[PDB]
Design a protein around this ligand. Structure first.
Ligand SMILES: O=C(O)CCC(=O)C1=CC=C[C@@H](O)[C@@H]1C(=O)O
Ligand SMILES: O=C(O)CCC(=O)C1=CC=C[C@@H](O)[C@@H]1C(=O)O
Ligand SMILES: [Mg+2]
Ligand SMILES: [Mg+2]
Lengths: 321, 321
C-alpha cells in the first residue's frame, strides 16, 4: 500500500516562569506534521521562534498546510520557509528511515547562578566537561572574573559562552583582561561577542579567545570562512531550513576545520530529540546545544530519554486536518 | 578619497553562425558593472543566459541598476538574482583585490565533427589531454562507438561528455555497451546522462561510467551528496549566484571528494577571464569548461590572453548611468 495520509497538529506548551530569550516567553507555540505512506510514518516539528524566525506561527501553519496538500498527491518541492522546511524534511527523512537512530541524547548544560554553586555542579560531571554560560548581562569585569574562577576551579572544563552581540570592542577587552591567558584556550568558543562581526573578528584575533557565529549564519550574505579566531558555528535547524541544508552547513564547517554545534530553538521534546539524532549523526564528536527542555512544563508525543517531565499524548493535541 | 561612482553598460555581441544551445543563439546580450571607490575599480558581468537563467536580460538590468543605486550610498546586501549576484560580487572582489590574478587562462577544448580529424587534433595536445564532447544528438550506438574510438586512439585522453539529460535507461545502456570497459575510467565524467536524476544515478552505478551534475545544481532542493558513480559537479557561476556561493559549492564538492568544474554560461571575454581566475584559484587542479569564446565574433573590454578576436573597447558600449 503506497496510500498517503497526513495530520497537522497545533499546540501550545507552557514555559516555566521567568524564561528569558531580552524578552520574556510565556508559551511555546508550534506545530507537528505526521506523514504516512503505507506502513510507514514520519514526524517533524514546525515551531518558528518569536524574535528570531522571520515567519510567525500562523504563517508557518499556512505554508505547512499548503505543502501537505501537495505532498498527498505526490512528491513536491520542499518549503523555503525555514521552520516548515526543517519539520517537513525531518518527517520525510523518518518516512524513508534516513534520519538515524541514536544511542546518546546529549546536551551541553546551560548554566547560571552563583559561581561557587556552579563549580560544585560542574566538578561532579561525568565525561568530558563542557557547559554553556551566558555573558553580556552583567558588566564585562564580572563576566571575566567569573569565567576565570570557573576555569581555574576545574582544569578540564571547557566553557561555551554567548554574548548575543552585547559588547563594544572595549567591553570585550574588559572581559578578556580578567581571563587568565593560560585558561583562554578552554573557552571552547564565545558566540557573537560584539555588536558587529568585524568587531567580533578583531576580538578573536586580538585576545586569542575563540569565537563562534550563531545569529550571523541566518543573515543575508553569510558565507562559511576559515579565519584566525573563528573556531565554531552554531547551527539552529528551525531557523535554518531543511535537514539537507543543515547537513550542507555541517559539511561546510568541517571542511574548514570548524566545529559545528547543532543547537536548540526551544523546540518541544519532539524536535529536540530529532536535533539530538542529527547531532549524533552529523556531529558525532560535538555535544549539541540542546539543554532547553527543562525550560518547559511538558513534553509532547516523543520523550527525551531520562526526562521526568509529563508527556502530552497525540490524542490531546489540536488537529487541523 | 573613499568617493564611490559606478557605470553600467549594456551590450550585444554577435555570435558565429550556427551556434546551438536545442535552440539557436544569434546574439549574446548582457551587461557590465564598473564600481569605483577612490583609486580602485572593479568590474563584473551580468549576462543571464536565455533558456537556462530564470531572469531575462531586462529583469537583470533593473535589479542591477537598483543595486548600484544602493551601493553608491554605502554597503548593502547582495542581489539574490543569480546573474546579478555573480557580476556584482565579482566587481566587489576586484575592488578589494580579493579575486586573485592567474598565470593560466585554461579551457577544456569543446570538440565536435569528424572523429578521425578530432583524433589528430587531440594527439597533438600538449599537457594533460582533457576534451569535452557532446553526446545525445546522434543515436546512442554512434555515440558509444565514437567515444570508444577516441579513447582507444589516445591512451592518455580523458573525455568529458554531456548528454544534457537526453537518454532513457535503455539509451544509456546502448551507449555504454560500445565503450570498452577497460577505457570507461577515462570518461572523466558524463554530465546528466538521463532524463531523470535517479536514472542517471542508476546509469552510473550499473555501467561504471562516472557522471556529473550540471543542470541539477540549479534545481530546487539540490544537495551536494557523495554517492557511487557521481564523480563531479559543474558549477556555472552566472546561473548560480555570488562568488561566495560559488566558493561554497566548490568547497562542498571537494569535502565530498568530488571534482568541481567551473564552467561557462557563454559569457563575454570579460566574464570568461574572471571564470578563469576563479578556476585557477578555487579549482587549481581542474581544467575549467570555458571554451566558448570562439563562438563569439568579438571580445569586449578585457582580453582572453592569446585570443585573436577583435576587441570592443569600453568607449563603444552603451552606458546606462
Ligand atoms: O546553544 C545552546 O546550547 C542552547 C540554545 C541557546 O543557547 C540559545 C537558543 C535560542 C536563542 C538564544 O537564546 C540562545 C543562543 O544565542 O545560542
Ligand atoms: O562546460 C564546458 O566545458 C563548456 C560549457 C558547456 O558545455 C555548456 C554551457 C551552457 C549550456 C550547455 O550547452 C553546456 C553544458 O550543459 O555544460
Ligand atoms: Mg547563541
Ligand atoms: Mg552540461
Amino acid at each position: 500500500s503506497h496510500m498517503r495520509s497526513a495530520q497537522v497538529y497545533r499546540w501550545q506548551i507552557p514555559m516555566d516562569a521567568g524564561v528569558v530569550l531580552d524578552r520574556r516567553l510565556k508559551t511555546r507555540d508550534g506545530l507537528y506534521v505526521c506523514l504516512r505512506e503505507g506502513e510507514r510514518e514520519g514526524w517533524g516539528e514546525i515551531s518558528p521562534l518569536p524574535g528570531f524566525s522571520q515567519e510567525t506561527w500562523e504563517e508557518a501553519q499556512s505554508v505547512l498546510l499548503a505543502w501537505v496538500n501537495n505532498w498527498l498527491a505526490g512528491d513536491c518541492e520542499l518549503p523555503q520557509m525555514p521552520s516548515v522546511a526543517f519539520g517537513v524534511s525531518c518527517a520525510l527523512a523518518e518516512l524513508t528511515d534516513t534520519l538515524p537512530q541514536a544511542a546518546n541524547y546529549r546536551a551541553a548544560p546551560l548554566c547560571n547562578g552563583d559561581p561557587d554553586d556552579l563549580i560544585l555542579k560542574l566538578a561532579d560531571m561525568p565525561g568530558e566537561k563542557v557547559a554553556k554560560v551566558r555573558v553580556g548581562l552583567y558588566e564585562a569585569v564580572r563576566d571575566g572574573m567569573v569565567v576565570n574562577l570557573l576555569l581555574e576551579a576545574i582544569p578540564d572544563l571547557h566553557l561555551r559562552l554567548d554574548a548575543n552581540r552585547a559588547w563594544t570592542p572595549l567591553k570585550g577587552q574588559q572581559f578578556a583582561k580578567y581571563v587568565n591567558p593560560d585558561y583562554r584556550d578552554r573557552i571552547a568558543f564565545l558566540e557573537e561577542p560584539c555588536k558587529t562581526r568585524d568587531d567580533s573578528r578583531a576580538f578573536a584575533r586580538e585576545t586569542g579567545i575563540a569565537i563562534a557565529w550563531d545569529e550571523s549564519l541566518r543573515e543575508p550574505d553569510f558565507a562559511f570562512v576559515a579565519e584566525e579566531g573563528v573556531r565554531a558555528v552554531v547551527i539552529k535547524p528551525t531557523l535554518t531550513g531543511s535537514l539537507e541544508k543543515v547537513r550542507e552547513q555541517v559539511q561546510a564547517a568541517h571542511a574548514l576545520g570548524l566545529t559545528a554545534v547543532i543547537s536548540s530553538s526551544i523546540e518541544s521534546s519532539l524536535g529536540l530529540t530529532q536535533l539530538a539524532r542529527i547531532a549524533a549523526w552529523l556531529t558525532p564528536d560535538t555535544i549539541p546545544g540542546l539543554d532547553t527542555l527543562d525550560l518547559m512544563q511538558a513534553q509532547q508525543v516523543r520523550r527525551w530519554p531520562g526526562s521526568t517531565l509529563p508527556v502530552v499524548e497525540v490524542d490531546a493535541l489540536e488537529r487541523l486536518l
